[PDB]
Every structure is written in C-alpha cells, then in structure tokens.
Structure 1
Amino acid sequence: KCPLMVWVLDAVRGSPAINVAVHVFRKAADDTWEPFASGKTSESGELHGLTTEEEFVEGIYKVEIDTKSYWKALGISPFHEHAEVVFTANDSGPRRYTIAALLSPYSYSTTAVVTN
C-alpha cells in the first residue's frame, strides 16, 4: 500500500518526535534534487502517504528531516541543520521502505526497514 514511510523518535524525551517537517527529493537527469513529497510527522512520530506505488519509481531519493527546527521549538541547541537519508529505490520484487530516525541534539541514527 504505502511504499515510503518515515518514523522519527526523540531520544531525549523518549517519545515520538511530533510535527517534524520532512521533505523528500528525487534526483533529476541533470543531477539536481527535485521536490517529490513532504509532510510533518504525526502525534505518533509517523509520516504516511508521502507517495504512491505508481509515482515511486526506481531512482535516487533524499529524505531531509528538519531536526534543527524541531530542537529549537523545544528550547534545545542542536548540532545538525537537518538529517539526510539518501538511497536508491530498487524494484527487486514487492518492496516497502520505512526510514526510522532517532534524534539526539548532537547525534542521530537512521535505519531502513525494507520489506516484501
């Protein structure tokens, strides 16, 4: 159903990271990043419905997570401007991508869960 989902967690509060802006880009033929989809994480730290199976073709995608704005709204001084997750989407049978990001003011981790 949903081919690309983003989950964001807050490692300082131990909670979902709510209202985090997320911008997805697709690399164009001229090597520039073209806006593809965007949204804000929900109360559960999830962002669903970014794209459809039809539109999400093979290509290089960048998921930018606006971490600095998130920390600033919480009164915390962070290190990063934003987190970037860059990957190739490949048709190798049925696939769904979940990008999980765990945020700390001076650190972050990201993991991809790719399922059939």
Structure 2
Amino acid sequence: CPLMVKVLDAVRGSPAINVAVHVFRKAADDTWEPFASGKTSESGELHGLTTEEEFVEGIYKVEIDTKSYWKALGISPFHEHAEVVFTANDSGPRRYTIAALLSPYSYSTTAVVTNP
C-alpha cells in the first residue's frame, strides 16, 4: 500500500469513521482526473486505494469530505472539505501516509513519507 489516509476527530477523541475520501491526479491537459476513492473504516484508516504499478509520478489531490462528516453529527462546520495537494514519486517510488486531525473550525494535516 503506497497511499494511505488516517483521519481523527479532535472533538470526540476518536478515529473519524466513514469519512469519504476522493483522490485525483493532474492530467496532461492540466485538469483533475478521478484516481480513486473510499471511506475510512472503524479505525479511521483508508487503505487499498491503489497499487505501486498504477501510482505513477504526478501531482495528486486528496480530498477529505469533512463537511458531510460533521453534519451527520449535528454540527455545522466551516470548511467544505480538506484538500491535500502534492507531487508524488518524482524521485522514485515512495509510500505516503496522509494524516488529518479534524475539528469544526479547524484541521491540520501532515504527511509521512517512507522509502520502501
């Protein structure tokens, strides 16, 4: 698994469950092309998004649908979603973990990159 996502809830102190995540890749014509999608599990993690074979060099955008997550909890959040845009594998294949901590009016994201 070359691309994984981990989301946590800072209001409840638990993993953010069933959060929709859409992954896009910058196409040749400079437009966002659908690449993969999923929902986080019980532990707030999302795996199996792609393979080393399909995860080629490029600029990717990871969109986390925070808005839907909060509303389903009766909270009216500030952000429409959280976006993480980055260039991947431009110096050979690597493994990426995109982590996100969510709050109604705030979120922070970090990336952990390891060489296989």
TM-score category, normalised to shorter length: over 0.9
Could you tell me whether the CA contact under 8 Å between 2:58 and 2:90 is conserved in 1? no
Structure-2 separation of matches of 1:59 and 1:80: 26
Structure-2 separation of matches of 1:13 and 1:32: 37
| TM-superposed deviation, 1:94 | 4.6
Where does structure 1 lack aligned partners over 5 or more consecutive residues? none
Where does structure 2 lack aligned partners over 5 or more consecutive residues? none
Question: Which stretch shifts more, 89-98 or 7-16?
Answer: 89-98
Structure-1 separation of matches of 2:90 and 2:54: 13
Question: Which stretch shifts more, 93-102 or 68-77?
Answer: 93-102
Structure-2 separation of matches of 1:46 and 1:79: 23
Question: Which stretch shifts more, 85-94 or 12-21?
Answer: 85-94
Could you tell me whether the CA contact under 8 Å between 2:17 and 2:42 is conserved in 1? yes
With normalisation by structure 2, the TM-score equals: 0.96
CA-based RMSD of the aligned residues comes to 0.9
Structure-1 separation of matches of 2:89 and 2:22: 20
Post-superposition CA distance 1:74-111 (Å, at most 9, x none) = 11110000000000002434511000000000000000
Query: Per the alignment, do residues 57 and 93 of structure 1 end up closer, same or farther by CA in structure 2, a change over 3 Å counting?
Result: closer
Could you tell me whether the CA contact under 8 Å between 2:52 and 2:93 is conserved in 1? no
With normalisation by structure 1, the TM-score equals: 0.96
Indicate the SS of the match to 1:70.
helix
Post-superposition CA distance 1:19-57 (Å, at most 9, x none) = 000000000011110000000000000000000000000
Identity %: 99
